Design a protein around this ligand. Sequence first.
Ligand SMILES: Nc1nc2c(ncn2[C@@H]2O[C@H](COP(=O)(O)OP(=O)(O)O)[C@@H](O)[C@H]2O)c(=O)[nH]1
Ligand SMILES: [Cl-]
Ligand SMILES: [Mn+2]
Ligand SMILES: [Mn+2]
Ligand SMILES: [Mn+2]
Length: 535
Amino acid sequence: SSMSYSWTGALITPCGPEEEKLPINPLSNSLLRYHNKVYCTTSKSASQRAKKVTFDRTQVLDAHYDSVLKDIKLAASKVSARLLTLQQACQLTPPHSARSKYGFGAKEVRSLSGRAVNHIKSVWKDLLEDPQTPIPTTIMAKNEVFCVDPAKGGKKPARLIVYPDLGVRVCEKMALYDITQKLPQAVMGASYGFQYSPAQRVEYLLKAWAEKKDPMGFSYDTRHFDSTVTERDIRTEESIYQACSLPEEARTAIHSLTERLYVGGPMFNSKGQTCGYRRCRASGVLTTSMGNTITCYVKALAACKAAGIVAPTMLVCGDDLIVISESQGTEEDERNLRAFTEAMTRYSAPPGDPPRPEYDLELITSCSSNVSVALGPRGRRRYYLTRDPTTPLARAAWETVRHSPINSWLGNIIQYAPTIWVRMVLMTHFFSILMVQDTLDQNLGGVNPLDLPAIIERLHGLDAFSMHTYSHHELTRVASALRKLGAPPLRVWKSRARAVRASLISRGGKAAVCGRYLFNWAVKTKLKLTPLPEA
RNA sequence: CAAAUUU
RNA sequence: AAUUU
Ligand SMILES: Nc1nc2c(ncn2[C@@H]2O[C@H](COP(=O)(O)OP(=O)(O)O)[C@@H](O)[C@H]2O)c(=O)[nH]1
Ligand SMILES: [Cl-]
Ligand SMILES: [Mn+2]
Ligand SMILES: [Mn+2]
Ligand SMILES: [Mn+2]
C-alpha cells in the first residue's frame, strides 16, 4: 500500500558547516595512525540514505498481533497521565535546542520569555482547534563519526532526522511527556529496556538465562526501522496512548498531533524548499523512542507467538531486542527463528541481518554491545558489558577546528571501565594526555578526572580495577580493532601504562590514587586494593 | 531532532 | 557533557 517517502528532487541541505580533519591531529596522533579511516557522515551522503529508506510497504496482521495489542491496551488503562503546564514543558527543552522559525530559541523558551510563551499558546490553540492540517517539518542529516569499513561498503550514508519547529516540540511535551514517563514501563514491565542500568541489564540477562532448563537466545534489529513504521502503526500507537486515563484536552492534542504530525507530512530542507513528503516515523518527535519501543514490542511478542518460541523473556530498547527462550532443539529453533522473521516481515519490521539462535550469552549483540566474562580478584567469574571498540576509537580521533574528543575518551572510560580496551588503551592515553597538558584538575563535561576511581567503583564495583583473563572473543576483537585503526598493540599500551602510572603515583594526591587503582593491571607486583571513602 | 542511561 | 536507540 503506502510508500515511506516521496521526493521533490530538492537536495537535503546542511544546517551549518561540516568540518574536515586537519593534516595534524595533535591529541590523537599518538593514539592511532590511520586517520584516513575516520570520517563524519556528511549531508551530501543524505541523498543515498533517502534511496535506501524509500520503499513500498505492505502489512498483514493476524490473531497473534491482534491478541497482543488487546492485552497491551488493558495494560495502558491501569495508567493515569496528566497534561504538562506550558511552562513545565518549556523547562524540559534542552539548552541548545534548535531555534524557532518564528524568531526565538531555547534561551527564551527555558527562561519563559513572553514572545516565546505567546507563540506556544497560539500553537497549542491551533492543535486544539484544527485536527487535519499537516504540520511542516525540517529534514536534516545526522553527522556521526565512524571508521571506514571497506568490507561493509566504504562509508555509511547519513541517517535522516525529521523534526517540527520548536513551538510544536514544546506542545508535544505538554500533551505527551507524562505518558512517556509512565506508559512503556506499564505496558512492557520488566521487558522495558531503558528502565535498567547496565549492571541491571546484565543481571537481567543472566537471570533470564539461568531460569531456562535449556536456554536459547537471539537478538533482532529492524532495517531502517523508522521507514518501516506505517500510518496504521502510528494510529495504533495513538489508540494505545488514548487507552489511558487522560484529560479531554490531551486527547484532542494527541489525536491532532497524531494526525497532523506523527502519521506524516511535508518536509523542507534547511534552505526552505519542499523536500519531499513522509508517511512513516519522523525521528525527531517526542514519541520517537516510546513509539519505536512499544510498537517494536507488539510485533515482536506477536512474532514470538506466531513462531512458537517457548517461555520468551524479552528486552526491548527501541527497535533492538533480545529474547531468551527455552530451546526446542537446534532443528526446531532454526525453524522458529525463520518463522519469527517472516512474522516480523509481514508486520512490516524486517531484519537487517537475519537472526540466528545462539546458546552462549557472549554471542548475542544488541544496541551495539554484548555481555562478556572475565575473572575477578578472588578468581570468581565477573560478567560485564562491552563492545567492538572500533567506533569509540574512531571517535577518539575525531579532532577538528571546532571539536575536541577528550570528552568521548572520558564518556567511554566511565561507561566501559571494566573492558580491557578502556583499561589498557583509552585510560592510558587519556591520562598520558592530561599529565603532559598538566590539566588533571580541569573539569571535563562536569566531571573531575581525579574522581574517576570513585566514580568507577560507584558504577562498576571495585572489581573493575582487578579483572583479568579476558575472553578469547574480546581479546581477538580488541587486537583486531587496534590493528584496523593503526594503533599500537596491547603490549605497547602495557609499557605506556607503566610509565603513565609511575608518573601519577609519584605525583601524589588523588593522581596517585588514580595511578594505583586505574593501572594496577599494569604491574607484576599488584597491590591490595580496598574500597573508597568517596563512594 | 527526540528520548533513555551515565555524570 | 558522554553513550545508545
Ligand atoms: N530521534 C532520533 N532517533 C534515532 C536516532 N538514532 C536512531 N534513532 C531511532 O531508532 C531507530 C532504530 O535505530 P537503528 O537500528 O540504530 O537504525 P535504523 O534501524 O537503521 O534506522 C531509528 O530508525 C530511529 O527512529 C537519532 O539520532 N535521533
Ligand atoms: Cl573474584
Ligand atoms: Mn535498526
Ligand atoms: Mn483519536
Ligand atoms: Mn537498532
